[PDB]
Amino acid sequence: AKGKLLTTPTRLLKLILPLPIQPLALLIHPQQPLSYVERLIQAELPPVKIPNVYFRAWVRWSSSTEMGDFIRDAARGREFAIEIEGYNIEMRVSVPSFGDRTYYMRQRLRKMSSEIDGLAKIKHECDLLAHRSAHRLAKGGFGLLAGWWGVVYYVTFHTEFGWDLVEPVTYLAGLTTIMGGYLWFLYINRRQHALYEMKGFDIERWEQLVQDANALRREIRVIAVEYDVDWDETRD
Amino acid sequence: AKGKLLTTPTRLLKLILPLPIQPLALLIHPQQPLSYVERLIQAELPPVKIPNVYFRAWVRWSSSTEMGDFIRDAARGREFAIEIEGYNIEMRVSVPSFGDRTYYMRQRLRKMSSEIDGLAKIKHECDLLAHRSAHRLAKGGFGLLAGWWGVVYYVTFHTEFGWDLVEPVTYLAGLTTIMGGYLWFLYINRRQHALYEMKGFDIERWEQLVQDANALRREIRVIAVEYDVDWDETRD
Amino acid sequence: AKGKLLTTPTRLLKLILPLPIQPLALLIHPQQPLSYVERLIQAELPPVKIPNVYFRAWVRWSSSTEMGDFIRDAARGREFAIEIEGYNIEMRVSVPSFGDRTYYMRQRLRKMSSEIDGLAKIKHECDLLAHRSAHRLAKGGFGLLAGWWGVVYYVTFHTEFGWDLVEPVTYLAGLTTIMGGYLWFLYINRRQHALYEMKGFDIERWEQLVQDANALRREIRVIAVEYDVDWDETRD
Amino acid sequence: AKGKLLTTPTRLLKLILPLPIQPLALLIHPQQPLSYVERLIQAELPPVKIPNVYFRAWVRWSSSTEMGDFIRDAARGREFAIEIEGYNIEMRVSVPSFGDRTYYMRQRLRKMSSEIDGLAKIKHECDLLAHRSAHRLAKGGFGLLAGWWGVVYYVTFHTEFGWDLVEPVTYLAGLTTIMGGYLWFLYINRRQHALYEMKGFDIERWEQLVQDANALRREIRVIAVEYDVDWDETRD
Ligand SMILES: [Ca+2]
């Protein structure tokens, strides 16, 4: 008495019809027109000298509409139907809802997003580690700076040596600091990448997952514009 | 003895031809084959015992070719012909060039590009707004520098202290500047986001517009390769 | 009463089934419809007056569906069935999972990836070759710096000239260093290209391998979305 | 007596056959199999109870080969042929050569490359302009440096003033040079972009043309691998 329409992962639609007890089943690309379906069911139906077909939302549509708009309208109605010249019976067919279409896409999104959440925990933890290390180092450096400043002040202004004996000291100090920085540049040949490699985090995979998930979300919002809006991502 | 088709913006084709007051009007989807057009015309035409329709460019064409490919391969001559078996009439029909497709796409593209130009002008304005603040602060810095220069010149020549009391202080001063700058970075570890939130600007919408425009340009250029090349985006 | 098909690496399918010593073997391209398979089997089978073949998953399917879509929608059950009108035999046939397609693609992918790993190891070696040269030169620079430091220390404390003859010279010296470095840039306005030309390395080939590998990964992941997801590239 | 095969810009092939005086003409996607053509010509031919078809290079091929490999083989032969069960007609058909296929692609390449050559002339000329300007400036700077060095030497070592009156001079000089550099940074708020904008050169268009042309070259070399190699780009 009834038929069905179903969604596939490969953006094709799977029609099922109680056509002669033993139902027929078809695959339709959404950009195709309904005349494809009419021709194909004519091939599936018997002669009578060829039959005629009509698709209906109570209105009948033309045979040159793309499947997508027809389904938008039928989801507005929640079901559509078919009329044939000979059998004289209205074959009603159900239609997927929004979630009925976005099921596979949202499942992929949930898997990818849980993986990304784990990766984000990893990255955040090790980033804060490196953050604390660098800031402890900077605190020590500022301490050295303040010590040097107090030294030069209390020496030049409150010591019998004077600036005469102090300029060479601070010049040698500046050159030794440059030598230390140079030795450090060569000690390199930033630390976050080594923390990743030693911890197991990956970046190319990370951005790959993120990019795929963003394209997914954009397709979701596209269909949510076409279909009913307000799909509550946090609810999924 | 002549007709023509027309390009709607809905990826359909509105064929208009004389079918011997209101001439024969037909809606077509491009993926349809010519056999469906044949049956459609047969439905529109009177009896004879049904005639067989031929399409031509001469050459005789089949009945399974999609419309789009036939039109592409026809546009080198600007017209294609029909031969009905019954009426013995010569009929020719106009091929749409790149111009009509270009029209109903470029209109969307120009709307999008003008909107994007406005949005980018707004973003440019607010960028200038923050930039001039930073510029004024750097002007103040230049003023401080020149003040320090004049100070040390005065204390050198127009003073009895002499260079002996000058070199130490300024050195300490220089160190303090570094210290100050150092502290600044140490205080860091974002702002224009808030300036746009207060301005009421949309970045996701902007980027979506840009990417849609680029994709539509690519579609236009593809179909321009299908037809003759050199559609001259900058000119039109 | 059972058969199976197989996946060659040429985007064909080798069907093998019992057609009542050498069972019925058939080559298929996926874009073909099931009607061609029906006529092919009819040619292979004996007379009766020709029978009509049905395909099933229950559901009865049409005769225009491409093979690939039918297989995709069949793989949820791992088998699909045939019903011949004459013989009254029940026949079932095995659906290939993701594994066979994955096999004849992943083999190419692993070959490419291993070759790329070797090439990248070579490039890494030669990069290290130049890097160590630069490193040794910087070590020489460190030595010069420490020599200058010890020189000025000696002339300061272990010398009667005193700081008065020290500060000017070193200042000039520092300037000359800048001048030297300045001249170096002025002499500039490329080298590893020659090192690879002498090594005999191929960069265009390398990049082509990389891009082909990435595109083939994307194809695999697409067809993995078509079937069940999570093919785990890093694992296998 | 003879037929033809022709190339389209949209990677589809245009078959033309002397089939019933009034030739037939078909469009074939290269990845399709020859069984598509067999089915379609069966539909174009009369009954006899359906005819059979054979494609031949002297060998006959299967009806499940993709069109590309068949054409590779026929270009090895420079022509192929068709046989039918009832007509007993050896319908020989010609095949495009390498250039016969790459004609449109190479024409696009020539246009794009001439445009790019003009753009490259522009860029090279204005780049050399900026180059000369910057190097004249650097020569002047080096001259100032040498003047300063000679000044400080002949003053501190051959003038009655001495270092006592000179250190303040060069300190003030360094601060004034920093002030001048600071004023220069603010005079900005590199020159090649302004030269482009005032001259008319464009970059996004430039890289767009280059990217499209390189992808084109890759497709050309792909088909040159499939077909005969050594196509002599400089000859085109
Ligand atoms: Ca001094």
Query: How close is the Cα of A155 to the center of ligand 1, in Å?
Result: 16
CB contact under 8 A, D9 and B226: yes
Q: Measure CB to CB from residue C32 to each of D35, D138, D142 and give the nearest one.
A: D35
For residues C153 and A175, the answer to whether their CB atoms sit within 8 Å is no
Those residues whose C-beta lies under 8 Å from the C-beta of residue D18, and which sit 6 or more positions away, are D1, D2, D3, D91
User: Given CB atoms, is D149 within the 8 Å cutoff of chain C?
Assistant: yes
Single-letter amino acid, residue A12: L
Residue A140 lies in a domain: yes
Method used for this model? cryo-EM
> Which chains lie within 8 Å of chain C at 3 or more CB pairs, if any?
A, D
User: D152: domain range?
Assistant: 100-235
Residue B233 lies in a domain: no
User: Given CB atoms, is C168 within the 8 Å cutoff of chain D?
Assistant: yes
Task: Report the alpha-carbon distance of residue D20 to residue C36 in Å, rounded.
Answer: 24
Here the CATH number for the domain that contains residue D74 is: 3.10.20
B197 and B112 housed in the same domain: yes
Per the DSSP assignment, residues forming a β-bridge with D92 are D81
Write the DSSP string, chain A. Answer: --BEEEE-TTS-EEEEE------EEEEE-TTSBHHHHHHHHHHHSPP-----EEEE---B--TTSBHHHHHHHHHHHTEEEEEETTT---EEEE---HHHHHHHHHHHHHHHHHHHHHHHHHHHHHHHHHHHHHHHHHHHHHHHHHHHHHHHHHHHTTSSS-GGGTHHHHHHHHHHHHHHHHHHHHHH--HHHHHHHHHT--SHHHHHHHHHHHHHHHHHHHHHHHS-S---GGG-
Resolution in A: 3.7
A132 and A221 housed in the same domain: yes
C128 and C216 housed in the same domain: yes
B145 and B170 housed in the same domain: yes
For residues A67 and A28, the answer to whether their CB atoms sit within 8 Å is yes
Residue B231 lies in a domain: no
SS3 D24: strand
Q: How many CB atoms lie within 10 A of CB D133?
A: 12
D91 and D106 housed in the same domain: no
Locus of tokens 């440059």: A178
C6: its two tokens: 């197989």
User: Distances from the Cα of A236 to the Cαs of A10, A114, B61, in angstroms?
Assistant: 21, 12, 53
C41: Cα within 13 Å, side-chain hemisphere: 21
A139 and A199 housed in the same domain: yes
- Nearest partner of C25 among C16, C37, C38, C12, judged by Cα: C16
Residue C102 lies in a domain: no
Locus of tokens 């199999």: D33
**CA dihedral for C105, C107, C110, C114, sign (positive or negative):** negative
Name the domain boundary from B34, B64, B96.
B96
Q: Which residues of D are annotated as a binding site?
A: 167
Residue A56 lies in a domain: yes
C69: its two tokens: 């879509």
User: Given CB atoms, is A216 within the 8 Å cutoff of chain C?
Assistant: no
CB contact under 8 A, D66 and C32: no
A36 and A136 housed in the same domain: no
Task: Report the alpha-carbon distance of residue C224 to residue A111 in Å, rounded.
Answer: 15
Residue D62's Cβ-count burial label (10 Å; 0-12, 13-18, 19+) is middle
Q: Are strands C3-7 and C90-94 parallel, antiparallel or unpaired?
A: parallel
Q: Are strands C53-56 and C24-28 parallel, antiparallel or unpaired?
A: unpaired
C7 and C117 housed in the same domain: no
Residue D224's Cβ-count burial label (10 Å; 0-12, 13-18, 19+) is middle
Residue B162 lies in a domain: yes
Of chain B, the end-to-end C-alpha distance in Å amounts to 35
- Give how many domains chain C has, as a whole number: 2
- Nearest partner of B80 among B99, B98, B56, judged by Cα: B56
C74 and C133 housed in the same domain: no
User: Distances from the Cα of A19 to the Cαs of A50, A173, C64, in angstroms?
Assistant: 17, 94, 16
Name the domain boundary from A70, A96, A122.
A96
User: Given CB atoms, is C129 within the 8 Å cutoff of chain D?
Assistant: no
Residue B234 lies in a domain: no
Residue A102 lies in a domain: no
Query: How close is the Cα of D164 to the center of ligand 1, in Å?
Result: 8
C87 and C116 housed in the same domain: no
B160 and B64 housed in the same domain: no
Q: Are strands B79-84 and B53-56 parallel, antiparallel or unpaired?
A: antiparallel
The dihedral over CA atoms of D69, D74, D75, D77, expressed in degrees to the nearest 10, equals 140
User: Given CB atoms, is D69 within the 8 Å cutoff of chain C?
Assistant: no
Q: Which residues of C are annotated as a binding site for Ca(2+)?
A: 167
D82 and D108 housed in the same domain: no
Name the domain boundary from A72, A96, A120.
A96
